[PDB]
Amino acid sequence: YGPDAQVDRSRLAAVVSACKQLHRAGLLHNILPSQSTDLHHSVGTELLSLVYKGIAPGDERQCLPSLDLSCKQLASGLLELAFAFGGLCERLVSLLLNPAVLSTSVIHFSHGEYFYSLFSETINTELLKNLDLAVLELMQSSVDNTKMVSAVLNGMLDQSFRERANQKHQGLKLATTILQHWKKCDSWWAKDSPLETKMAVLALLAKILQIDSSVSFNTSHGSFPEVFTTYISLLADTKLDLHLKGQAVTLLPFFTSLTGGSLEELRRVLEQLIVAHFPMQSREFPPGTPRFNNYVDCMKKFLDALELSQSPMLLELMTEVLCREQQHVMEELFQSSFRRIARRGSCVTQVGLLESVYEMFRKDDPRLSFTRQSFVDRSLLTLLWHCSLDALREFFSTIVVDAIDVLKSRFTKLNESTFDTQITKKMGYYKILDVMYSRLP
Amino acid sequence: GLLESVYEMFRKDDPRLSFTRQSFVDRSLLTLLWHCSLDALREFFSTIVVDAIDVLKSRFTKLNESTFDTQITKKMGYYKILDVMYSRLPKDDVHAKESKINQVFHGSCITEGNELTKTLIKLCYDAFTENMAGENQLLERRRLYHCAAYNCAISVICCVFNELKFYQGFLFSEKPEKNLLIFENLIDLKRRYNFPVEVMDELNRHECMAPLTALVKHMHRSLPRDLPSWMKFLHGKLGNPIVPLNIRLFLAKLVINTEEVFRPYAKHWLSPLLQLAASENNGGEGIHYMVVEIVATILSWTGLATPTGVPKDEVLANRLLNFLMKHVFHPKRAVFRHNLEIIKTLVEC
């Protein structure tokens, strides 16, 4: 590393090219006699001390170099050349893990960080010849590291998500290890695990449903008792702030696939989230204050979440916010978005949607007659214009007997005067019948 | 049969107001349970109490549409159900193996009813522990629930835990690990009450005021004397004059309505009560009728402690005197003269 590279390191441009080819040809373990193991230990020391110490001239403590770029790629050539050889990664799987903070610029970060993060593509095209046989150590065959174990997957999910260059299945082969190994994700389980480690496992989980195409996270593929309960306890973080909550909920939707009682807390955590965060009185806001501006992003994001999930559980949550008042000052999105969600639905989906709001409307539970009418008019009827045919014949053949049975003989409770609930059911049914009989031949 | 119809009616999940659900329990169901013979306990108990406590133990949602006042009205309905029966239930008849202890726990149960009584104790405790820190909707109705939830604890503990050295924990032992006084779950802060002048007037039926003020006369039996009180009562004065700032309409009004009881170690608190009355307000534009009560610490019953000659009480007590004087004028002779004709008998004893 120095000024005469323009004049005197052609002697190294010679070597670095040559030896690489010789071990692309596999010959190089006859071109040097192996001293003690299938690792030529010189190769490990070249990592350690052609570069891992020479990248950091911390003896005179004159500032950490922005490399002369040719010298970066030949030093990457030494690293690449190191991966020509046996046993190498069995030191790297510790040589990553370096705590020494570089007093660089002059702002601080780790030498193991600087190394990995500089040599990201270098490692992250070539370490990959090993898949999980360091991920194993990274999570489990040592404590899942306080930080970078995860930045490993950030630098990974550039290239692995890029990867079609004569190889693929990257996510599939990854998944089956990184899920078993996700069992052992424990340093996050410190309450005060930094916003850094929260952000890491967050960005990772996004990039899971990205690389591990959800056909490969379908039912039990990654262990939901580990990885989903982890995501729920991530959403439940009260130090996790609302833009990052915003990404977190942006990967809720795929989990609306759960039929299990594991979904029970998916409603409760989203109830707990929105009720603590979003305004118990929404009437407060005219447009333009952050209190509103980042709230309307969250509002539209719950409608995106509905549009993706095709879910009666998101429908159910959404009823508590769309019915927050008459003229909650946004209504246009909650109305116009439903036009999109009712269009594409394959018939059994909307049969389930409608029944959740019907069952909700049917439930005798003490709640206001506004709240019962709003669910029918401001949502249930508001689904029944838009769709194809067959959305009639199925859903009809559920509700209409279980509806008309109430109409035909029940007329009391003027006496305590919740009677407005009886009649709200009765008009709810006439309005149910109205939309279907507008379509029934 | 009578009680079950009103219980089943209260239970039923028919859609109806939280007034309408509470009125059935309080204005009728409880209003049947004082008067009768015995056996009216043991039968009706052995219907409801499992089918009651099953709701208490895990259900806390529907803030989201906000019918939540029905959840808590059920919860206080049950604590008030438990309150009247545990006013009548004997000590051992709710720990020893009388077989309703078996059936309301598990099998012919192994413990001394310890699990059903400790789960009740945890639930009543938690239900008056619950902080109001983020509670931005249904505030009053949820606060009133935390109030009433203090009650049943009293009426079980006075029978199941007879002796002084249990009482520190089960209704009082809040280390400030977060959010301070359980008694601030029991009264909300920015609110008012009035104490008019002569020629009850604000009511003991305030939702914890009734069960606490009915207790403390019986704390003559169940006094350790100190410690269920110290961590709030010793400190609701100079040193932390903020904690009573409105909650003196707890601490002080309580203590006035406890001057029948507290005497044996009234020493350390009462000179700080004259300091407490030297506050910038005291239940009016000033002391109003409140001073009329406080002097009675020495002149309702002239016994045990003194605020003075122990400390040189001096200028603060002359503030209490000039409170009767600096702005003393009032109409029609009477309200004015009621300062005057009592100052004449204040300093003398």
Coordinates of N, CA, C and O in Angstrom, one line a residue, chain B residues 45-110:
Chain B
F45 N -73.5 -19.7 45.5 CA -72.1 -19.8 45.3 C -71.8 -20.9 44.4 O -71.1 -20.7 43.3
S46 N -72.2 -22.1 44.7 CA -71.9 -23.4 44.0 C -72.6 -23.4 42.6 O -72.4 -24.4 41.9
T47 N -73.4 -22.4 42.2 CA -73.6 -22.1 40.8 C -72.6 -21.1 40.3 O -71.8 -21.5 39.4
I48 N -72.6 -19.9 40.7 CA -72.0 -18.8 39.9 C -70.5 -18.7 39.8 O -70.0 -18.3 38.8
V49 N -69.8 -19.1 40.9 CA -68.4 -18.5 41.1 C -67.4 -18.9 40.1 O -66.6 -18.1 39.7
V50 N -67.4 -20.2 39.6 CA -66.6 -20.6 38.5 C -66.9 -19.9 37.2 O -66.1 -19.3 36.5
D51 N -68.2 -19.9 36.9 CA -68.8 -19.3 35.7 C -68.6 -17.7 35.7 O -68.8 -17.1 34.7
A52 N -68.3 -17.1 36.9 CA -67.9 -15.8 37.1 C -66.4 -15.5 36.9 O -66.0 -14.8 36.0
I53 N -65.6 -16.2 37.7 CA -64.1 -16.0 37.7 C -63.5 -16.4 36.3 O -62.5 -15.8 36.0
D54 N -64.1 -17.3 35.6 CA -63.7 -17.6 34.2 C -63.5 -16.4 33.3 O -62.7 -16.4 32.4
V55 N -64.4 -15.4 33.5 CA -64.3 -14.1 32.7 C -63.2 -13.2 33.2 O -62.5 -12.6 32.5
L56 N -63.0 -13.1 34.6 CA -62.0 -12.2 35.2 C -60.6 -12.5 34.7 O -59.9 -11.5 34.4
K57 N -60.3 -13.8 34.6 CA -58.9 -14.3 34.6 C -58.0 -14.0 33.3 O -56.8 -14.0 33.4
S58 N -58.6 -13.7 32.1 CA -57.7 -13.5 30.9 C -58.3 -12.5 29.9 O -57.6 -12.3 28.8
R59 N -59.4 -11.9 30.1 CA -60.2 -11.1 29.0 C -60.1 -9.6 29.3 O -60.5 -9.1 30.4
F60 N -59.5 -8.8 28.3 CA -59.2 -7.4 28.5 C -59.2 -6.5 27.2 O -58.6 -5.4 27.2
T61 N -59.8 -7.0 26.1 CA -59.8 -6.3 24.8 C -61.0 -5.5 24.6 O -61.8 -5.2 25.5
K62 N -61.3 -5.2 23.3 CA -62.5 -4.4 22.8 C -62.5 -2.9 23.3 O -63.6 -2.3 23.2
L63 N -61.4 -2.4 23.6 CA -61.1 -0.9 23.6 C -61.3 -0.4 22.2 O -61.7 0.8 22.0
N64 N -61.1 -1.2 21.2 CA -61.0 -0.9 19.8 C -62.3 -0.4 19.1 O -62.3 0.5 18.4
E65 N -63.5 -1.0 19.4 CA -64.8 -0.4 19.2 C -65.3 0.3 20.5 O -66.1 1.2 20.3
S66 N -64.7 0.0 21.6 CA -64.9 0.7 22.9 C -66.2 0.3 23.7 O -66.5 1.0 24.7
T67 N -66.8 -0.8 23.5 CA -67.7 -1.5 24.4 C -67.0 -2.0 25.7 O -67.6 -2.7 26.5
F68 N -65.7 -1.8 25.8 CA -64.9 -2.2 26.9 C -65.5 -1.9 28.3 O -65.2 -2.7 29.3
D69 N -66.3 -0.9 28.5 CA -67.0 -0.6 29.7 C -67.9 -1.7 30.2 O -68.1 -1.9 31.4
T70 N -68.4 -2.6 29.2 CA -69.1 -3.8 29.6 C -68.2 -4.9 30.1 O -68.6 -5.4 31.2
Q71 N -67.0 -5.1 29.6 CA -66.0 -6.0 30.2 C -65.8 -5.6 31.7 O -66.1 -6.3 32.6
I72 N -65.3 -4.3 31.9 CA -65.0 -3.9 33.3 C -66.3 -3.8 34.1 O -66.2 -4.2 35.3
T73 N -67.5 -3.5 33.6 CA -68.7 -3.6 34.4 C -68.9 -5.0 34.9 O -69.3 -5.2 36.1
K74 N -68.7 -6.0 34.1 CA -68.8 -7.4 34.5 C -67.7 -7.6 35.6 O -68.1 -8.2 36.7
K75 N -66.5 -7.2 35.4 CA -65.4 -7.4 36.3 C -65.7 -6.8 37.7 O -65.7 -7.5 38.7
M76 N -66.2 -5.6 37.8 CA -66.6 -5.0 39.1 C -67.9 -5.6 39.6 O -68.0 -5.8 40.8
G77 N -68.8 -6.0 38.7 CA -70.0 -6.8 39.1 C -69.6 -8.0 39.9 O -70.0 -8.2 41.0
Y78 N -68.6 -8.8 39.4 CA -68.1 -9.9 40.1 C -67.3 -9.6 41.4 O -67.6 -10.2 42.4
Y79 N -66.5 -8.6 41.4 CA -65.9 -8.1 42.7 C -66.9 -7.7 43.7 O -66.8 -8.0 44.9
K80 N -68.0 -7.1 43.3 CA -69.1 -6.7 44.2 C -69.9 -7.9 44.6 O -70.4 -8.0 45.8
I81 N -70.1 -8.9 43.8 CA -70.7 -10.2 44.1 C -69.8 -10.9 45.2 O -70.3 -11.3 46.3
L82 N -68.5 -11.0 45.0 CA -67.6 -11.5 45.9 C -67.6 -10.7 47.2 O -67.6 -11.3 48.3
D83 N -67.6 -9.4 47.2 CA -67.6 -8.5 48.3 C -68.8 -8.9 49.3 O -68.5 -9.1 50.5
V84 N -70.0 -9.0 48.9 CA -71.1 -9.3 49.8 C -71.0 -10.8 50.3 O -71.2 -10.9 51.5
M85 N -70.6 -11.8 49.5 CA -70.5 -13.1 50.1 C -69.3 -13.2 51.0 O -69.4 -13.7 52.1
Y86 N -68.1 -12.6 50.7 CA -67.0 -12.6 51.6 C -67.2 -11.7 52.9 O -66.5 -12.0 53.9
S87 N -68.2 -10.8 52.9 CA -68.6 -10.2 54.2 C -69.3 -11.2 55.1 O -69.3 -11.0 56.3
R88 N -69.8 -12.3 54.6 CA -70.6 -13.4 55.3 C -69.8 -14.7 55.4 O -70.0 -15.4 56.4
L89 N -68.9 -15.0 54.5 CA -68.1 -16.3 54.5 C -67.2 -16.4 55.6 O -66.3 -15.5 55.7
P90 N -67.2 -17.4 56.5 CA -66.2 -17.6 57.6 C -64.8 -18.0 57.1 O -64.6 -18.5 56.0
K91 N -63.8 -17.8 58.0 CA -62.4 -17.9 57.8 C -62.0 -19.2 57.1 O -61.4 -19.3 56.1
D92 N -62.3 -20.3 57.8 CA -62.0 -21.6 57.5 C -62.9 -22.2 56.5 O -62.5 -23.0 55.6
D93 N -64.2 -21.8 56.4 CA -65.1 -22.2 55.4 C -64.7 -21.8 53.9 O -65.4 -22.2 53.0
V94 N -63.7 -21.0 53.8 CA -63.0 -20.6 52.5 C -61.5 -20.9 52.4 O -60.8 -20.5 51.5
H95 N -61.0 -21.7 53.3 CA -59.7 -22.4 53.2 C -59.7 -23.9 53.5 O -59.2 -24.7 52.7
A96 N -60.3 -24.4 54.6 CA -60.4 -25.8 54.9 C -61.3 -26.5 53.9 O -62.2 -25.9 53.3
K97 N -61.1 -27.9 53.8 CA -61.8 -28.7 52.8 C -63.3 -29.0 53.0 O -63.7 -30.1 53.1
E98 N -64.0 -27.9 53.1 CA -65.5 -27.9 52.7 C -65.6 -28.0 51.2 O -65.0 -27.2 50.5
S99 N -66.3 -29.0 50.7 CA -66.1 -29.4 49.3 C -66.4 -28.4 48.2 O -65.9 -28.6 47.1
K100 N -67.0 -27.3 48.4 CA -67.0 -26.2 47.4 C -65.7 -25.7 47.1 O -65.4 -25.2 46.0
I101 N -64.7 -25.7 48.1 CA -63.3 -25.4 47.8 C -62.7 -26.4 46.8 O -62.0 -26.0 45.9
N102 N -63.0 -27.7 46.9 CA -62.7 -28.7 46.0 C -63.2 -28.4 44.6 O -62.4 -28.2 43.6
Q103 N -64.5 -28.3 44.5 CA -65.2 -28.1 43.1 C -64.9 -26.8 42.5 O -64.8 -26.7 41.2
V104 N -64.6 -25.7 43.2 CA -64.2 -24.4 42.6 C -62.6 -24.4 42.4 O -62.2 -23.5 41.6
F105 N -61.9 -25.3 42.9 CA -60.6 -25.7 42.3 C -60.6 -27.0 41.6 O -61.5 -27.3 40.8
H106 N -59.6 -27.9 41.8 CA -59.4 -29.1 40.9 C -59.5 -30.4 41.8 O -58.8 -30.5 42.7
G107 N -60.4 -31.3 41.4 CA -60.7 -32.5 42.1 C -61.2 -32.3 43.5 O -61.5 -31.2 43.9
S108 N -61.1 -33.3 44.4 CA -61.1 -33.1 45.8 C -59.8 -32.5 46.2 O -58.8 -33.2 46.5
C109 N -59.7 -31.2 46.1 CA -58.4 -30.4 45.9 C -57.4 -30.6 47.1 O -57.8 -30.7 48.3
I110 N -56.1 -30.6 46.8 CA -55.1 -30.8 47.7 C -54.7 -29.7 48.7 O -54.4 -29.9 49.8

